[PDB]
Design a protein around this ligand. Structure first.
Ligand SMILES: *[C@H](O)[C@H](C[C@@H]1CCNC1=O)NC(=O)[C@H](CC1CC1)NC(=O)OCc1ccccc1
Ligand SMILES: *[C@H](O)[C@H](C[C@@H]1CCNC1=O)NC(=O)[C@H](CC1CC1)NC(=O)OCc1ccccc1
Lengths: 303, 303
């Protein structure tokens, strides 16, 4: 038993991280088969980044402007192209450690593992949820761009995120591996801000089920409510509306605990209106919304 | 910027995990050079585990009683011995992926990464602190024994933990890689319980410094206190006493923020006496004590 925020093992992705240098800029790239993917803003200078025309900037580059290093071994660039906000560098060697992989775009409310990297070298791994406002609450320093986010399913790595920037509130923004931003953000130094956010209701309910499975029961009650009545409380507290599909995906957890989803919704209603009164749930004094039903089932099925 | 609980990249350890089978018991082992390390209770049956004499049980085993599998490839056992609570199986192949490594025992209050594994296959990675009562708050299911905890320092893996059991309160206990338990625990099914725990004061202070570096300042005040006066408050709230050495290790964080340690201690005193009044620090509504000064410096130096 026990419930811990847990990342996927990072080894398959570690074998894909390289260092990409252009001019005086060095960031990380992802080396899959004979292609290296990295943020296109690596081709920019300090003044280029205020208002860049990336088509112009890439036309003025050649293959020899790009230094790719897989550890000590330098990789020779034999071609370059752009796909939206990602640069693709073709190299003269297929990565012998390329895993089975997909490029997938994730939905708000879904989670993924981030392998934070600097100078092509992985430094740490942690879980992130895609917020409803299309930011993530990461930990990224200078040089972290090109770090990727991913999920793993039976030795297949689904890449879903490449890191590009930090917003003024300290949250982070990036693209999928096709180079399309999550959210209404652009890769230049301007005055962008995250929109208003909301709490991921299905995830809070999943975490309450994890709590029960791990023996935290103090917040339970005898009451049940209706979907429509619960969704009125959700709007008051800036929670997403609960759909019937969300009720359906919580089915397994509802079955394992014998607590109906609308039964647990009554508990959430009381927690929202009354607070915790000094108590904790799974080691937290706040309602946690960054665990998906899948994340919970992964750790709580055996319990 | 950003501050996230972060594990070390797990790839170097993933390449060392194998599956060890004895009888109808299957758990995980750690394959380094030509030796596999695993919990000795793998040699026990259901009735053996109530009150085992491990010297007798191992004398009655032979090499062919042990099935070791590195993925699909079965490894041939050519010798076996016991070191305290760990079984060492000598195999006819040195692990080609053996990293530079050490076996180190950690101190309460220190952190490490856990690579949770089942059937020799890594499933997730997360950070744990060794509690003052020598337990950890993990996430371990049946089959997780033999999973290891580690820190990484310049491609050298320092192994510090191997998982053995779950206590009745849901926390976890295990050994160092020499097979010596952390804490007053034994590897048999009996009525063991964790002793009383305390809060790791130097870690809470380190986390408050991380908060300031990341822009959370609401808990700061103009007051300073003395070491002796603070240690009186620490005893009332079941916090460890602050030593001068702890003040010294917080030096860099104190310098980076311009807030003296005894200045920050006044803030902690107020938080302990008054609570948070509905506010949060680094996304938590509780005082967090599982980040070391090193953990904080790793993420906050660049900020
Ligand atoms: C790429 O490595 C870098 C990552 C930032 C650096 C600090 N934390 C991060 O996540 N990205 C940038 O520097 C981008 C580049 C523009 C998108 C084209 N700019 C940026 O993030 O500016 C905000 C910022 C905040 C704090 C410190 C530096 C920069
Ligand atoms: C080894 O894989 C297993 C790990 C436990 C299983 C559930 N969570 C864990 O951490 N260890 C054991 O089963 C040990 C064996 C005895 C030490 C010799 N026993 C044990 O943990 O018993 C407590 C327990 C609690 C919940 C479920 C099963 C067992």
């Amino acid at each position: 038993s026990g419930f811990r925020k847990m990342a996927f093992p990072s080894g398959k992705v570690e074998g894909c991280m390289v260092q990409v240098t252009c001019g005086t800029t060095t960031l990380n790239g992802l080396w899959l088969d004979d292609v290296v993917y990295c943020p296109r803003h690596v081709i920019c200078t300090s003044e280029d980044m205020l208002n860049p025309n990336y088509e112009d900037l890439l036309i003025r580059k050649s293959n020899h402007n790009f230094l790719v290093q897989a550890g000590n071994v330098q990789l020779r660039v034999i071609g370059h192209s752009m796909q939206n906000c990602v640069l693709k560098l073709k190299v003269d060697t297929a990565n012998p450690k390329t895993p089975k992989y997909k490029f997938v775009r994730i939905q708000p409310g879904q989670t993924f593992s981030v392998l934070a990297c600097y100078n092509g070298s992985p430094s740490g791994v942690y879980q992130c949820a895609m917020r409803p406002n299309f930011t993530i609450k990461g930990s990224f320093l200078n040089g972290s761009c090109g770090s990727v986010g991913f999920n793993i399913d039976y030795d297949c790595v689904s890449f879903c995120y490449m890191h590009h920037m930090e917003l003024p509130t300290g949250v982070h923004a990036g693209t999928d591996l096709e180079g399309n931003f999550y959210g209404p953000f652009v890769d230049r130094q301007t005055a962008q801000a995250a929109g208003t956010d909301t709490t991921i209701t299905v995830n809070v309910l999943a975490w309450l089920y994890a709590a029960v499975i791990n023996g935290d029961r103090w917040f339970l009650n005898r009451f049940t409510t209706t979907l429509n009545d619960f969704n009125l409380v959700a709007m008051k507290y800036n929670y997403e509306p609960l759909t019937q599909d969300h009720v359906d995906i919580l089915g397994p957890l509802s079955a394992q605990t014998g607590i109906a989803v609308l039964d647990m919704c009554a508990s959430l209603k009381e927690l929202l209106q009354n607070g915790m009164n000094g108590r904790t749930i799974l080691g937290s004094a706040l309602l946690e919304d960054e665990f998906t039903p899948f994340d919970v089932v992964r750790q709580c099925s055996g319990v």
